[PDB]
Amino acid sequence: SMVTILILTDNVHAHALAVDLQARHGDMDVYQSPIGQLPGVPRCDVAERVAEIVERYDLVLSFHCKQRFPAALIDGVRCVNVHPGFNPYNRGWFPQVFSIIDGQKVGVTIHEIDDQLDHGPIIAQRECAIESWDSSGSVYARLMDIERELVLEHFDAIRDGSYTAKSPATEGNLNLKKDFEQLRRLDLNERGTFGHFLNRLRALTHDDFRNAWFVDASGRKVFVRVVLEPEK
Amino acid sequence: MVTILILTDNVHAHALAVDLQARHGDMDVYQSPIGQLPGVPRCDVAERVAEIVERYDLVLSFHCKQRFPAALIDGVRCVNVHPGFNPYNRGWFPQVFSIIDGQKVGVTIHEIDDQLDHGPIIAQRECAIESWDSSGSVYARLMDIERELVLEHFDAIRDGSYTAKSPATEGNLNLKKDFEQLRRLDLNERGTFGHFLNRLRALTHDDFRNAWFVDASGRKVFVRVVLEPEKP
Numbered sequence: 270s271m272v273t274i275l276i277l278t279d280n281v282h283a284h285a286l287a288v289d290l291q292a293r294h295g296d297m298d299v300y301q302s303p304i305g306q307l308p309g310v311p312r313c314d315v316a317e318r319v320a321e322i323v324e325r326y327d328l329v330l331s332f333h334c335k336q337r338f339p340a341a342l343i344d345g346v347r348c349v350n351v352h353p354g355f356n357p358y359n360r361g362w363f364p365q366v367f368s369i370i371d372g373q374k375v376g377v378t379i380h381e382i383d384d385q386l387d388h389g390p391i392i393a394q395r396e397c398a399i400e401s402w403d404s405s406g407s408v409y410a411r412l413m414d415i416e417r418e419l420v421l422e423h424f425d426a427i428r429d430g431s432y433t434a435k436s437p438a439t440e441g442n443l444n445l446k447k448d449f450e451q452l453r454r455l456d457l458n459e460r461g462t463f464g465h466f467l468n469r470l471r472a473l474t475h476d477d478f479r480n481a482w483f484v485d486a487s488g489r490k491v492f493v494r495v496v497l498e499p500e501k
Numbered sequence: 502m503v504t505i506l507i508l509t510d511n512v513h514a515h516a517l518a519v520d521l522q523a524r525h526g527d528m529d530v531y532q533s534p535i536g537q538l539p540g541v542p543r544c545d546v547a548e549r550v551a552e553i554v555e556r557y558d559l560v561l562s563f564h565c566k567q568r569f570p571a572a573l574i575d576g577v578r579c580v581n582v583h584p585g586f587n588p589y590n591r592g593w594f595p596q597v598f599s600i601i602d603g604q605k606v607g608v609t610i611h612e613i614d615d616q617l618d619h620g621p622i623i624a625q626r627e628c629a630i631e632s633w634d635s636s637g638s639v640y641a642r643l644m645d646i647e648r649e650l651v652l653e654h655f656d657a658i659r660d661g662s663y664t665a666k667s668p669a670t671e672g673n674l675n676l677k678k679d680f681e682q683l684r685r686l687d688l689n690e691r692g693t694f695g696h697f698l699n700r701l702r703a704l705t706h707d708d709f710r711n712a713w714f715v716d717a718s719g720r721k722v723f724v725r726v727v728l729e730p731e732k733p
């Protein structure tokens with residue numbers, strides 16, 4: 270416990286996991302970002318507190334981070350992120366949405382932070398299979414389980430720094446919030462295969478979220494989501 | 502005064518028949534030899550023609566899918582209630598086919614001749630198909646329309662005092678095989694998004710596992726869609 274850890278996440282599941290990690294480890298603080306929406310969780314404005322953070326902490330561990338860390342922070346203290354995609358494929362926003370569409374792997378990756386988003390030396394990663402009946406929702410739920418097991422399994426090694434991280438072979442691709450937003454509008458005139466349309470719908474089905482929509486002939490907006498059930 | 506035989510295998514029509522029995526009273530309610538209503542007696546119409554003609558003044562069927570023997574038609578006045586808008590998508594599950602082809606759907610009360618859902622129309626009422634409708638949601642409305650249309654015209658149907666008009670054209674007829682064919686989704690089929698979306702909503706009826714495909718690993722997967730219009 271000579272290792273003093275700062276945990277940063279705006280994600281509700283990662284936060285719950287951070288709380289368990291706290292019970293287990295002890296010398297550990299949990300914050301969210303200035304724009305995070307977790308109720309009752311204090312906020313570190315990382316961009317301003319670089320000095321405090323470096324002096325005060327031995328390791329900064331973030332979950333699902335979307336902003337880049339300032340170079341000075343990356344230098345002054347060991348920074349690690351947990352991303353719920355399989356780097357370097359579909360880095361950035363909502364990896365399993367884009368993976369359902371393009372067929373690239375999804376999973377959870379624990380990695381050292383550099384100046385680019387979801388980039389740089391990989392500590393560990395597990396792939397998550399995408400079944401033909403999976404929606405974004407069902408995959409995401411599995412990813413959160415994988416994340417919990419992966420992080421818990423490797424916590425000691427992350428804490429102690431007893432790993433050798435390996436950079437991915439290639440740069441992969443990056444998706445941003447705009448990219449998800451563009452997927453949401455369904456163009457009723459677009460041509461494609463049924464499989465293509467079906468993937469589109471399931472990639473945009475996540476429990477109750479009203480993601481996919483079209484505007485009908487009379488100007489009414491209609492929300493679409495899909496239900497896929499494999500036989501017993 | 503007028504003794505009615507009601508024939509239906511449909512659960513909603515049966516309930517409606519039970520109410521009509523409470524009103525008119527000189528009326529028996531049966532199902533067919535292959536119907537599945539719990540505890541409802543069965544007329545094997547094909548073999549009881551002489552008895553039916555003798556015993557009854559009107560045979561009123563709901564959602565009939567088998568053709569009446571010519572002997573019965575000539576021997577007693579036969580009227581059918583069909584949950585389609587004759588002559589369009591006569592036969593099986595009209596709104597399923599109507600959602601896909603854009604023809605009108607509704608409820609038609611008509612005289613029975615030698616062909617299925619054919620012969621002089623007594624009364625009919627159209628049901629609008631909204632862009633967010635599924636087969637399930639249309640069908641619920643069809644069952645309400647059927648109730649209202651039948652209660653409105655009951656005395657006249659009972660009386661025999663209506664005018665009836667033959668439809669101008671033959672229309673089209675859909676059979677169980679046709680519905681069965683629709684169910685199989687071909688993931689390589691090309692079309693517009695709107696087309697595919699109509700196909701899925703057409704095959705969505707509450708919990709029915711209608712639409713299906715077989716994935717690469719040989720696993721059968723059922724598909725339904727959930728459409729929700731914004732608050733008007």
Ligand SMILES: O=c1ccn([C@@H]2O[C@H](COP(=O)(O)OP(=O)(O)O)[C@@H](O)[C@H]2O)c(=O)[nH]1
Pocket residue numbers: 280281332333353362363364365366405406409473474475478480
């Ligand atoms: O408007 C949204 C926001 C999120 N999600 C889904 O919910 C998951 C959780 O995203 P969240 O914003 O909770 O945080 P992240 O997973 O990016 O940390 C995402 O992967 C999306 O699949 C969605 O369907 N619509």
Ligand SMILES: O=c1ccn([C@@H]2O[C@H](COP(=O)(O)OP(=O)(O)O)[C@@H](O)[C@H]2O)c(=O)[nH]1
Pocket residue numbers: 510511512564584594595596597636637640704705706709711
């Ligand atoms: O295997 C089935 C059977 C019925 N239905 C739906 O349920 C409605 C009523 O079916 P029913 O068997 O009661 O036939 P009906 O008496 O209306 O001809 C149909 O129009 C279909 O929309 C379905 O989707 N799949």
Ligand SMILES: [Cl-]
Pocket residue numbers: 391392393435
């Ligand atoms: Cl490795």
